[PDB]
Amino acid sequence: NNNESLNRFNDIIQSLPARTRLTICSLCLLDNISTQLLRFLILNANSPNIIAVLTDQSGETEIFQTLVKLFKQIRMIYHTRSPLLSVHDVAPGLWFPNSPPPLILRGHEAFIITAIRKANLLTFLLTSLNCLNYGFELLQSIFLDIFCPNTQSGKFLKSQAILYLDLKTQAYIAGLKEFQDETNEISLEKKQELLDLIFPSNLADILVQRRTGDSGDITLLTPSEKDFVERCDRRRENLKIVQDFNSLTQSYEWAQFIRELLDYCNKNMGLIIWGRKGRGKSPLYDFDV
């Protein structure tokens, strides 16, 4: 079906329980508000943006805050225990994660997955901008799910490896900045805790096991993953020997990180939302006839 409105579900709507009618029909709300806000974020990525994007009380800021508030309210429709939406939150009792889609949703799979992937990308981005209640530590745990979509069957390549390493490094800076005093001296015990969580020694095992299960070992580590692990080990070691917290934030500048993250999402939006770039078609702007 090519109907983008809730009418696309008219053939099945009465076969569903009332609350699943709500979560299914409200996918149009979730796709619209997510597209509006992703558009806005990309459109305003190169500007005084660290100022403009903020949940705390500019005309663009009033628009941003209106969009963010709408996103949170529409997203709340789905009663999720996890920050990331899944197909089971949309069709509970019908579509189970890592299972074939139910027959009754045939012809709606791409529409449903597109909508939740836009929303999940937004949860990530808005958490980065500290516009949601989640801490920075949540970002690292959802990164691969969002930026390596299992079209796990999504390949972790050099572009994701670069973004991931910057993200892990910002999570260390954010973890320190939380417990940093006016002095520039870095707490050594908090330093070692963050490094062990963010740059673990079994990272290669983690990367492989996430794709293959408990039976895979570093034999199946891909070349891109291998390079990422080595740069992570080296990043951890160099971070051990930095004591000046302010020089850390100068080395890995926040406004520069956010800019590169937004520019990444713009250039890779097709891969994130659809799984493959394909042509230079944007999921945010459909121009097909």
Resolution (Å units): 2.0
**And the tokens for 236?**
């951890």
Cβ contact 124:142 at 8 Å: yes
Phi and psi for 244 in degrees, rounded to 5?
Answer: -90, 105
Tell whether 83 and 148 lie within a shared domain: no
Last residue of a domain, one of 134, 159, 184: 134
Which of left, alpha, beta for 172 (phi over 0: left; psi -120 to 50: alpha)?
A: alpha
At which residue do the structure tokens 């909508």 appear?
115
Tell whether 233 and 270 lie within a shared domain: yes
As a whole number of angstroms, the distance between CA 264 and CA 194 comes to 26
As a whole number of angstroms, the distance between CA 147 and CA 121 comes to 8
Tell whether 257 and 164 lie within a shared domain: yes
Tell whether 183 and 256 lie within a shared domain: yes
Tell whether 88 and 130 lie within a shared domain: yes
As a whole number of angstroms, the distance between CA 129 and CA 53 comes to 7
As a whole number of angstroms, the distance between CA 68 and CA 37 comes to 7
Cβ contact 74:35 at 8 Å: no
| Domain range enclosing 202 | 138-289
DSSP line for 107-141: T-HHHHHHHHHHHHHHHHHHHHTT-SSS-THHHHH
Last residue of a domain, one of 86, 116, 134: 134
Q: What is the DSSP letter of 282?
A: B
As a whole number of angstroms, the distance between CA 179 and CA 89 comes to 36
Determine, yes or no, domain membership for 193: yes
Determine, yes or no, domain membership for 1: no
How many domains is the chain partitioned into structurally? 2
Tell whether 107 and 150 lie within a shared domain: no
Cα Dmax for the chain: 65
As a whole number of angstroms, the distance between CA 250 and CA 280 comes to 35
For 158, other C-beta atoms within 10 Å of its C-beta total 11
As a whole number of angstroms, the distance between CA 41 and CA 96 comes to 32
CA distances from 107 to 11, 113, 177 (A): 11, 12, 48
As a whole number of angstroms, the distance between CA 124 and CA 150 comes to 17
Q: Name every residue whose Cβ is closer than 8 Å to that of residue 158 and which is 6 or more positions away in sequence.
A: 224, 227
Tell whether 251 and 110 lie within a shared domain: no
Phi and psi for 285 in degrees, rounded to 5?
Answer: -135, 105
Size of the chain, expressed as the number of residues it contains? 289
Determine, yes or no, domain membership for 256: yes
Task: Tell me how the structure was determined.
Answer: X-ray
Tell whether 103 and 195 lie within a shared domain: no
CA distances from 253 to 67, 81, 228, 256 (A): 27, 33, 21, 5
Tell whether 83 and 149 lie within a shared domain: no
